[PDB]
Symmetry: C2
Subunit: 260 residues, 2 copies
Amino acid sequence: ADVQQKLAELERQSGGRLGVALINTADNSQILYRADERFPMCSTSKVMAAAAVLKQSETQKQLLNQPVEIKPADLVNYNPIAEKHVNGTMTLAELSAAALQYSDNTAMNKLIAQLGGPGGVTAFARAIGDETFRLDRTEPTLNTAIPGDPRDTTTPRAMAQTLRQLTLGHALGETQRAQLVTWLKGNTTGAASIRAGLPASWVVGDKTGSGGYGTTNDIAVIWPKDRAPLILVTYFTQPQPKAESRRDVLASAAKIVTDG
Amino acid sequence: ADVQQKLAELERQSGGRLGVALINTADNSQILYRADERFPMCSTSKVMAAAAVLKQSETQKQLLNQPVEIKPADLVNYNPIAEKHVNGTMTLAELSAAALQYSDNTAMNKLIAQLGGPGGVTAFARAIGDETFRLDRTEPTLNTAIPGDPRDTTTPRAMAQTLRQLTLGHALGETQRAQLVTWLKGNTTGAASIRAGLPASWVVGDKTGSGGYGTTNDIAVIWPKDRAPLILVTYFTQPQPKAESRRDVLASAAKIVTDG
């Protein structure tokens, strides 16, 4: 498929390493590029954690309304929502939204804590059939993104398959699946990434990721004009530790794979 | 200045006409580039409409809870939220959010009708001291953005002053100002525009706009790390009817005026 040549071209131009997995739910067809290679997830991992919390709330029916304490010492490097609530509290719902829609790192650490550490986020992945995801660290160190380090990684194929089960399948209860999709469709950080390569009429929920080595990621559920939904993972990392983000590469990958 | 020269260099290479107004509320200093020329607002006008409804909600305190009918005939050209609710209803709060955060055109038309037509939006503008803003048409024809047409235009200076008064000033009651800022901070469509030219740590609320003649707009309230807020308006329009959007130009603008 010319799609392979275009993604290769894109990758070469960019100077980095590009991973892509597209699932077309119209017929289960896939478009795959380095789809079995590991990449640092950075903030795209917030989807597994918010989902895991949603799964716990299937049993603990009030859990999303539980207030959680935010102390000044809980603040980390990017706390756009949580900083408003220091010496106060946010609900687990508020925290899940802040993590997903604002990429709030404080909010992610609270989700992590609620699940019993990075291992509880990994346990949830395993419960829904994802044998590849691993979360190893909290924010912000889960973003180091060191070339060859397996920590805090997954593969595009695995993340796409998981995002399909979570947003379109039966990994979560119907209310919880709906809540996840609502959160993702309200993301504030995504217009420069996958969405930017798609026709304006298409509806999208996504989570972006950013970290070291110019790691620039996005995972998305997509409801095109006139077509069954798609899942798309676009992962991108660079050779230089202080490399600049490249959201435009993800936009470009999305354009390439949804023409074909 | 250096900034002026840089903005001229950006405009000369952009293939269009660029309008910028930056107000720095630390000291009321300004950066102005074609800031008294008119441009088509497109969906940036949705701030005025939402605000005018928020003002109405100061005296009809249930107003935002009021259900409004969405009929198939109401659907226009970009209805990401309203299409889900056809033969159903949306509240005015939902309509205000859908217009501001998703740029839903059906939702804007409901705001307009709740305000008595385009005239009514303009009358609100006049009421808070904006003599420049004019809303003439409903969606989607308000976006035709024909050069020389004064319908549905304003100037960068007037829009920056108005956004300041609405988000940081006393045009709205405190509850209502806070609601507006919250909705703007939750915008889904802004990551490739002004936000893309600012440091990540800075908090932004914005409203983008797109229309005919490649018109690509963004207005923003910005809370820089360590500094009093800024108000930024970046307006751009091109000479060909079918020109493509240029969000990149707005990000470049934002970087030039906030570097200096």
